[PDB]
Amino acid sequence: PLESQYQVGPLLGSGGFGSVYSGIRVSDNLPVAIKHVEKDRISDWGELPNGTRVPMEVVLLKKVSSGFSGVIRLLDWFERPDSFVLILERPEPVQDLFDFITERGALQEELARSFFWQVLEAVRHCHNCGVLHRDIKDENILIDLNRGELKLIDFGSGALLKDTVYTDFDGTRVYSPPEWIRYHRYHGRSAAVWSLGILLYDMVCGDIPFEHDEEIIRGQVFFRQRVSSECQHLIRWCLALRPSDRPTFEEIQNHPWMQDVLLPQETAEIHLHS
Numbered sequence: 001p002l003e004s005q006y007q008v009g010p011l012l013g014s015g016g017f018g019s020v021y022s023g024i025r026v027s028d029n030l031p032v033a034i035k036h037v038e039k040d041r042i043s044d045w046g047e048l049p050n051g052t053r054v055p056m057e058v059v060l061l062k063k064v065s066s067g068f069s070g071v072i073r074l075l076d077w078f079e080r081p082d083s084f085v086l087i088l089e090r091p092e093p094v095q096d097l098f099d100f101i102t103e104r105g106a107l108q109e110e111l112a113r114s115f116f117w118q119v120l121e122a123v124r125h126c127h128n129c130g131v132l133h134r135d136i137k138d139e140n141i142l143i144d145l146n147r148g149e150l151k152l153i154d155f156g157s158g159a160l161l162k163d164t165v166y167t168d169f170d171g172t173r174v175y176s177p178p179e180w181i182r183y184h185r186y187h188g189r190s191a192a193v194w195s196l197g198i199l200l201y202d203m204v205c206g207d208i209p210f211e212h213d214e215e216i217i218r219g220q221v222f223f224r225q226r227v228s229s230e231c232q233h234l235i236r237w238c239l240a241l242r243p244s245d246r247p248t249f250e251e252i253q254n255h256p257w258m259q260d261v262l263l264p265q266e267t268a269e270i271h272l273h274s
């Protein structure tokens with residue numbers, strides 16, 4: 001074991017998730033991402049299936065780990081004196097969705113449809129594995145530019161999926177639902193759908209719709225870019241004020257705006273010039 005297995009590269013990013021570097025598994029020259037999280041900054045702790053103290057983030061990552069490429073895969077992890085290090089897979093080339101939108105502005109709907117659709121599949125796999133992400137946003141989605149495949153990252157605000165009410169939340173406030181802002185209460189699925197509405201608006205308009213608490217609770221959507229009525233309808237549906245008025249995942253994916261999605265490789269060929 002140890003750090004004789006990986007070769008540390010350049011720092012890729014840092015924030016409330018920790019510090020993530022580009023790395024390479026020395027044994028087979030595999031692209032990886034090495035994430036460092038400080039023990040003092042870990043508020044949410046969980047217990048591993050076998051029974052050990054590790055970040056909830058690790059527990060969640062293991063539960064969503066499969067051959068399905070829609071969620072980042074945890075290849076290994078290590079416990080250090082005052083930190084945990086997570087070895088995650090790393091697509092190359094890659095660009096996260098926030099940077100992609102920052103550079104390209106509002107996305108054409110065919111592209112938003114392919115991206116949104118893949119996020120939905122990804123979120124669904126999480127929930128099917130009994131994991132709630134709680135921080136769906138553009139900064140937490142990676143685009144494998146060659147394959148046109150999206151990957152959901154950063155499970156550091158997540159939790160075990162449950163049917164009961166959540167009274168805690170440390171995700172992004174501007175993607176958080178009116179029921180959280182006003183009452184510090186939300187249910188997993190409907191909160192997720194609310195953030196998915198914020199993400200879709202972000203994709204087709206080039207920016208989030210709400211910046212202030214006042215705006216979230218009002219829930220009034222103004223489209224700053226030209227967006228089809230079908231797309232506006234689905235966004236509006238995802239951003240319903242009453243959680244029970246929001247669509248299920250099945251309803252979102254059955255929506256008329258979501259029909260005839262491009263396959264990922266097709267998406268890369270048309271829009272990511274691959």
Ligand SMILES: O=C1Nc2ccccc2/C1=N/c1ccc(O)cc1
Pocket residue numbers: 012013017020032033035072088089090091094096142153154155
């Ligand atoms: O895997 C990654 N490749 C990248 C390339 C550029 C910028 C960020 C990243 C990654 N970040 C991660 C952050 C939290 C995770 O749980 C997993 C990956």
